[PDB]
Amino acid sequence: GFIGNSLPMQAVYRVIESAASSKATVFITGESGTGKEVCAEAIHAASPRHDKPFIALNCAAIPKDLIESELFGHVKGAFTGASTERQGAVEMAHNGTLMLDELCEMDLDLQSKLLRFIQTGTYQKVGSSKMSSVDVRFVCATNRNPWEEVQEGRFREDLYYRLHVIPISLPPLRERGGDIIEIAHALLGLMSLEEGKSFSRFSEPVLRLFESYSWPGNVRELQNVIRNIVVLNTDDEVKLEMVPPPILEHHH
Ligand SMILES: CC(C)(C)COC(=O)CSc1n[nH]c(=O)[nH]c1=O
């Protein structure tokens, strides 16, 4: 679902294609704001299981005490807030692909349960001793340095070596050549649709700035910048005065 054919993304696309035909776990890393879910979905889409579900669990966007419920499900009354019975991500993903995003947010107890599940396919809903099984292809992702997490005792060593089979390091936006403006154009059209505007082009100074700035927040930061421009301005062309801070200030 990536845009562009920059040299470093070509390498990513070759690994996606080759990995897609295997069930081996993929382990994605990259700087803040790189497209980890886009990569995971591309692997699923290229795989023989593309017609089955792709499910992404963002472990950070769930309270830590509730990741297990989100992942494995829960029976009614399993814990104080369990108003009903819940199907876990692993069931939603059966015969498909499960992306565990921000995986290092899981506590060590949950990591142990995840490792059993990865080894066997077996799991239990929270609040239940009954065993179930599913078949999922795993893709993991993290913004942390997963090796560092292991060294500091926050991530299980056995889990790391079980998961770290096909690593993919996503290129940061500043290294992606012509992709930056191709992505910016796609965002410009989408945000214009969202906002009821009609931006269609960037001036030459804006192109130069977008192609020289370091984008420390990568594609998320680019999305913010295009959103800012389209929300605050009405024109067909993005002009340099429209670019928000601190893009220019930091650039210099
Ligand atoms: C406009 C569009 C929906 C394509 C934007 O999507 C995102 O920005 C997702 S993250 C991403 N998308 N495409 C890339 O080439 N690299 C990315 O990181």
Residue numbers in the entry: 141 to 392
From the reporting publication:
The most potent of these, with an EC50 in V. cholerae of 4.1 μM, was a tert-butyl analog previously called compound 12 and here renamed AzaU. To characterize the mechanism of AzaU inhibition of LuxO, we crystallized V. angustum LuxO-C in the absence of ligands (apo), in the presence of ATP, and in the presence of AzaU. AzaU bound in the LuxO active site, with its modified uracil ring occupying the same region as the adenine ring of the ATP substrate, indicating that AzaU functions as a competitive inhibitor. Indeed, consistent with this structural inference, ATPase assays using LuxO-C showed that AzaU inhibition is enhanced at lower ATP concentrations, as expected for a competitive inhibitor. Strikingly, AzaU binds the LuxO active site in a manner that mimics the R-C linker, with both AzaU and the R-C linker forming H-bonds with Arg 316 and Gln 363. All three protein structures are highly similar (rms deviation < 0.5 Å). Rather than forming closed rings, V. angustum LuxO monomers in the crystals form continuous helical arrays with six subunits per turn. We also observed the same helical arrays of LuxO monomers in crystal structures of the V. angustum C domain alone (LuxO-C), either as the apo-protein, with ATP bound, or with the inhibitor AzaU bound (discussed below). Our crystal structures do not reveal any substantial conformational changes associated with AzaU, CV-133, or ATP binding, possibly because of constraints imposed by the crystal lattice. In particular, the conformation of the GAFTGA loop, implicated in σ54 binding, is unaffected by either inhibitors or ATP, adopting in all cases a conformation similar to that of ADP-bound NtrC1. Alternatively, extending the idea that AzaU recapitulates some of the key interactions that stabilize the R-C linker in the ATPase active site, it may prove possible to engineer potent and selective second-generation inhibitors that capture even more of these interactions.
